[PDB]
């Protein structure tokens, strides 16, 4: 009897179909407690305490966790982030220079915190010129509704909630093109991987299998109504928003998973940590994070 707690986040992406179908529990035989978390930083804390054994992290919280020597490994990429993550602002903010003096919310050290800082640097705006405030996405939505912030760099469901009456100023496809790409990954605690390697393998299988039909033909995948409804439910977004969100990232074949986990993810962590250090968010970083990545479960 295996019990495993999986920390998940709200991105609308094809592997949510396997989550809704309970495929991981069915194939692994484990009792799975799927726990929704509002951002990666809170997942890092739950991984470090042992309350969570498998967790979905943005690349920015991943780099923070690895720089603190949390005993976790990336064993699977979830997505390469594009415009599914975006900076949405009040409609009177028309140009990046209009961000000066404004109150912009991001969840602390999320991929969108990282991308906001990378976007400001690319634009030549110092982060001290913007009032950057840290709120979790439910609080961001509530503060936006009451007019207490001028914008936020967010993912679903906050990104589409804000965009209904706001404007997109930049997004993570653009910030990636400017040289600061972000990723979503799955990580596992070493002690869990040591005791239940076949359960970890079954998690990776369930996620990879769910994404391949989308990769093969996005438009055919998106017209299967149960694919849309399952993502709408788990992400908390209207069905009409799901296709745009799903198309806002790219996903990996099994060959691409093995390729990325054998070098590129390490390099991504190295660079992400270095930028976070330069922005004053992490005190110490390493020049190699190979301890934090593995291909052995795919």
Numbering used by the authors: 22 to 319
The publication says:
2-Aminoethylphosphonic acid (2-AEP) was selected as a structural analogue since it contains a phosphonate group instead of sulfonate. Although, 2-AEP has the same structural configuration as taurine, very weak binding could be measured, Kd of 649 µM, between TauA and 2-AEP. Despite the very low binding affinity between TauA and 2-AEP by ITC, a complex could be formed under crystallisation conditions. The 2-AEP is co-ordinated in a similar manner as taurine with an additional hydrogen bond between the phosphonate group and the side chain of Ser109. This hydrogen bond is absent from the taurine complex and it is a result of the different rotamer that Ser109 adopts in the presence of 2-AEP in order to co-ordinate the smaller phosphonate anion. SBPs have to undergo large conformational changes between the apo and substrate-bound states driven by ligand binding and in the case of 2-AEP, it is likely that 2-AEP binding that is also coupled to local conformational changes at the binding site, Ser109, is unfavourable, thus allowing the TauA to distinguish over smaller ligands. The crystal structure of TauA with 2-AEP suggests that although the phosphonate group has the same tetrahedral coordination as sulfonate, it cannot be effectively co-ordinated in the binding site and that the ethylamine group alone is not sufficient to co-ordinate tight binding of 2-AEP to taurine. The internuclear distance for the sulfate and phosphate anions has been determined to be 0.38 nm for S-O and 0.36 nm for P-O suggesting that the smaller 2-AEP phosphonate ionic radius results in weaker interactions with the binding site of TauA. Despite the high structural similarity between taurine and 2-AEP, the later also displaces 10 water molecules.
